[PDB]
């Protein structure tokens, strides 16, 4: 299988990257031509954040962290299913039973993280209600 046609494509796309950047740099009118008030550098008002107009100045939930952390074990489970795809016929029943076992052990992990509700954001800080109880004497 030849890939010299593919190589020229990758090279052209690499050339297309330089063209997109520089075409802006050669077609925009000179700062003097428009208003001359300054370049992007000195014009710090124009080169700044957007805060809807008013100038101002990540303790993320642990549930978000466990979403990203648990992505890695579940990704290596999916990527290790790749060898079974292109060899499903020649491993027969034996490799099919092994594959199912390879999935059951990982599912017991899915059960564990489903019961603990690890991914739920939860609301421990707020949403409290109480019963007004009179304390007659």
């Amino acid at each position: 299988m030849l890939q010299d046609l593919f190589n020229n494509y990758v090279i052209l796309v690499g050339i297309l990257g330089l063209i997109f950047l520089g075409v802006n740099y050669f077609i925009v009118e000179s700062p003097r031509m428009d208003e001359n008030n300054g370049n992007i550098s000195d014009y710090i008002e124009k080169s700044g954040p957007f805060e809807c107009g008013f100038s101002s100045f990540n303790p993320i939930p642990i549930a978000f962290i466990l979403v990203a952390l648990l992505f890695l074990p579940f990704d290596l489970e999916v990527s290790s299913m790749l060898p079974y795809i292109v060899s499903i016929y020649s491993v027969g029943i034996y490799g099919l039973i092994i594959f199912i076992l390879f999935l059951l052990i990982l599912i017991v992990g899915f059960i564990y993280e489903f019961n603990t509700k690890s991914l739920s954001i939860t609301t421990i800080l707020h949403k409290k209600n109480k019963a007004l109880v009179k304390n007659l004497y």
């Binding site: 925009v28 101002s56 979403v67 999916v78 795809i85």
Partner: protein, 235 residues
């Protein structure tokens, strides 16, 4: 194809991660997990189709659908593929990254001129690509809607002249284009009909609903194929 897409995911989260704007840097932690979470679902669906043909070649998958289109046996995977495809391109209703009402332009609230176009062009190259990929995996790719109409049209040209091969190439890409257009239509169509989905309920959707189903099928399709002695081989 899956490796190349995951490089683009790395490209998306980098936009905000080099910025101090609060709106732009907001759409990194939520952007990162949304793409991370629905990448498992998109990767597994592609692997189930690859398991039915026992080939990781795009051309072999398309040709394997001659007698049947994988939308008929694997209709649920097509809904799961299309749902996942929306999230990966950050299209609505999975729009929470660049939500105008929530985080303005998202990462693009600090982008202007060329960096805006290049990033905007990327979102629409993915839309065209992921619409073409749904055509390839479930609607037969470049295969004709009718073999008879395909045969009748091509009999009007002589196979010994280059005019025959232009017509076939126009036809074969035409079938793909019509199938792909229907899904580029559905990208827009769902945007005009579904309100945006909340992010916290969005991460729990792919993990607590989609992933168990996708692993359930990946243990289901090998079972049905083995039961009838129909394990696939690359001819």
């Amino acid at each position: 194809l899956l490796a190349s897409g995951s490089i683009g995911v790395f490209g998306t989260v980098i936009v905000g991660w080099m910025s101090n704007s609060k709106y732009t840097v907001l759409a990194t932690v939520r952007t990162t997990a949304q793409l991370i979470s629905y990448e498992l679902v998109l990767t597994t669906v592609v692997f189930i189709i690859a398991l039915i043909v026992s080939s990781l070649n795009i051309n072999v998958i398309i040709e394997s659908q001659y007698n049947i289109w994988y939308i008929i046996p694997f209709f649920p995977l097509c809904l799961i593929f299309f749902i996942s495809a929306l999230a990966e391109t950050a299209r609505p209703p999975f729009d929470n990254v660049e939500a105008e009402s929530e985080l303005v332009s998202g990462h693009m609230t600090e982008l202007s001129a060329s960096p805006f176009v290049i990033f905007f062009l990327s979102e629409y190259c993915s839309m065209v690509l992921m619409s073409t990929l749904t055509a390839i995996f479930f609607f037969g790719g470049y295969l004709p809607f009718s073999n008879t109409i395909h045969h009748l049209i091509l009999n009007l040209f002589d196979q010994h002249s280059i005019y025959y091969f232009i017509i076939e190439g126009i036809l074969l890409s035409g079938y793909l284009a019509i199938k792909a257009n229907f899904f580029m239509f559905s990208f827009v169509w769902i945007r005009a009909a579904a309100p945006r989905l909340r992010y916290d309920l969005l991460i729990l959707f792919c993990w607590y609903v989609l992933l168990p189903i996708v692993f359930a099928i990946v243990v289901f399709a090998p079972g049905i194929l083995y039961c009838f002695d129909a394990l696939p081989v690359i001819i």
